[PDB]
Copies of this chain bind each other. A is one copy, B any other.
Amino acid sequence: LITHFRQAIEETLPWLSSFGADPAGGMTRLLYSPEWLETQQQFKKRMAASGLETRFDEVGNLYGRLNGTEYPQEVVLSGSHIDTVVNGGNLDGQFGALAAWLAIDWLKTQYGAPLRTVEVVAMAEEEGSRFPYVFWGSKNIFGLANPDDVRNICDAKGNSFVDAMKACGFTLPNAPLTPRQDIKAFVELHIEQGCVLESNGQSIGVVNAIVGQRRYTVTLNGESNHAGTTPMGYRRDTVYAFSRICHQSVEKAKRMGDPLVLTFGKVEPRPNTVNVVPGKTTFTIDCRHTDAAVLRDFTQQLENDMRAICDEMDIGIDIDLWMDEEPVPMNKELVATLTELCEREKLNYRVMHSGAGHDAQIFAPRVPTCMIFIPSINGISHNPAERTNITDLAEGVKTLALMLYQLAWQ
Contact = CB atoms under 8 A, between A and B. Distances in A.
A86 interface: no
Given A195-B230, A226-B379, A269 B272 contact: no
A226 B194 contact: yes
A308 interface: no
A352 to B, nearest CB: 10
Contacts of A258: 231-233
Interface stretch (A22-30, A73-81, A236-244): A236-244
A109 B305 CA distance: 67
Interface stretch (A59-67, A275-283, A341-349, A398-406): A275-283
B193 A226 contact: yes
Interface in A176-206: 192-196, 199
Interface in A331-386: 354-356, 379, 381
A269 B246 CA distance: 14
Contacts of A221: none
Interface of A: 192-196, 199, 211, 213, 215, 225-234, 237, 239-240, 242-247, 250, 253-254, 257-269, 271-278, 284-286, 288, 354-356, 379, 381
Contacts of A226: 193-194, 355-356, 379, 381
Contacts of A253: 232
Contact of A274 (B215, B237, B239): B215
Nearest to A322: B274
Contact of A228 (B250, B261, B277): B261
A262 B225 CA distance: 12
29 contacts: A196-B231, A196-B234, A199-B234, A213-B228, A215-B274, A226-B356, A227-B265, A227-B286, A228-B261, A228-B286, A228-B288, A229-B356, A230-B355, A231-B259, A232-B250, A232-B258, A233-B254, A240-B246, A243-B246, A243-B264, A244-B247, A265-B274, A265-B277, A265-B278, A266-B269, A266-B273, A266-B274, A274-B284, A274-B286
A71 B253 CA distance: 76
Q: A interface, by DSSP: helix, strand, loop or mixed? A: mixed
A229 B275 contact: no
Nearest to A239: B264
Contacts of A269: 265-267
A315 B26 CA distance: 29
Given A194-B229, A237-B250, 6 more contacts: A194-B226, A195-B234, A225-B379, A228-B261, A265-B273, A266-B274
A245 B240 CA distance: 10
Contacts of A199: 234
A375 to B, nearest CB: 11
B244 A232 contact: no
- CB-based closest 9 A-B pairs: A194-B229, A228-B355, A229-B355, A243-B246, A243-B243, A227-B263, A243-B247, A274-B284, A228-B356
